Amino acid sequence: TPDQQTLLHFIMDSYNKQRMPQEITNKILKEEFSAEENFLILTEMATNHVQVLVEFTKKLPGFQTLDHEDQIALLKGSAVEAMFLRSAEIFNKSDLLEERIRNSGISDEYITPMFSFYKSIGELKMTQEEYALLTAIVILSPDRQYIKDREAVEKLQEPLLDVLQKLCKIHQPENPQHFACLLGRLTELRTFNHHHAEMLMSWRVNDHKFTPLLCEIWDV
Amino acid sequence: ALLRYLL
Ligand SMILES: COCCOC(=O)c1c(C)nc(C)c(C(=O)OC(C)C)c1-c1cccc([N+](=O)[O-])c1
């Protein structure tokens, strides 16, 4: 559809500008390997994921028209899912990062479900457009805590879901299951809200300096 | 405040 193609190109122009700075990528190879240096790298990565996702969010069609408090509630409420999704994308476009994660002092209670999500979404071989649309769909969720005008958010989310589904008919014709499989990775993704809340209470994790952006977006 | 600034 003519209005849908315009929507999609707008999403892609914004999504394609997102990149993790090469300098962080180099750190994966170049830094000393210790629990503390490893944790720091993951912190800088997480911080940059939020940075990028804010820039992406403020370019989503309609987002600037929303009530200001609702904007904030979206950013904070969708942060955990969006960041986790983005970290899966980064990881799957690496062996070394995995080893750093496995040796950063983070408990296997949290590491295990993380790698299961990464593997699951990796096996789906999602295209750049699927990542972009899903990301936008996660950010524009009308069910976040404290949203005053949920119907306004729903009107921004629904055309993205339509484009995404419709795309799935276009590129994977006669297989309704590709789209349903995308939505099942979203089911895994949402389980991370609870994993995250528990990690923040944990000893190792909370006895660190998180960056200011992480502190703020996670309501620490 | 941080979030509003970046937005
Ligand atoms: C690329 O970064 C990995 C993705 O990172 C997150 O998006 C993320 C989220 C939502 N919540 C927390 C509290 C952290 C965290 O405490 O910071 C790092 C410094 C240890 C990170 C997190 C990091 C690793 C594992 C897990 N985990 O549940 O397995 C969570």
Automatic annotation (TrEMBL), chain B:
Cellular compartment(s): Nucleus
Function text: Transcriptional coactivator for steroid receptors and nuclear receptors. Coactivator of the steroid binding domain (AF-2) but not of the modulating N-terminal domain (AF-1). Required with NCOA1 to control energy balance between white and brown adipose tissues. Critical regulator of glucose metabolism regulation, acts as a RORA coactivator to specifically modulate G6PC1 expression. Involved in the positive regulation of the transcriptional activity of the glucocorticoid receptor NR3C1 by sumoylation enhancer RWDD3.
Subunit structure: Present in a complex containing NCOA3, IKKA, IKKB, IKBKG and CREBBP. Present in a complex containing CARM1 and EP300/P300. Interacts (via C-terminus) with CREBBP. Interacts (via LXXLL 1, 2 and 3 motifs) with RORA (via AF-2 motif). Interacts (via LXXLL 1, 2 and 3 motifs) with RORC (via AF-2 motif). Interacts with APEX1. Interacts with BMAL1. Interacts with CARM1. Interacts with CASP8AP2. Interacts with CLOCK. Interacts with DDX5. Interacts with ESR1. Interacts with HIF1A. Interacts with NCOA1. Interacts with NR4A1/Nur77. Interacts with NR4A3; potentiates the activity of the NR4A3.
Family per similarity comment: Belongs to the SRC/p160 nuclear receptor coactivator family.
Name this polypeptide is given: Nuclear receptor coactivator 2
UniProt source species: Homo sapiens
Lineage start: Eukaryota, Metazoa, Chordata, Craniata, Vertebrata
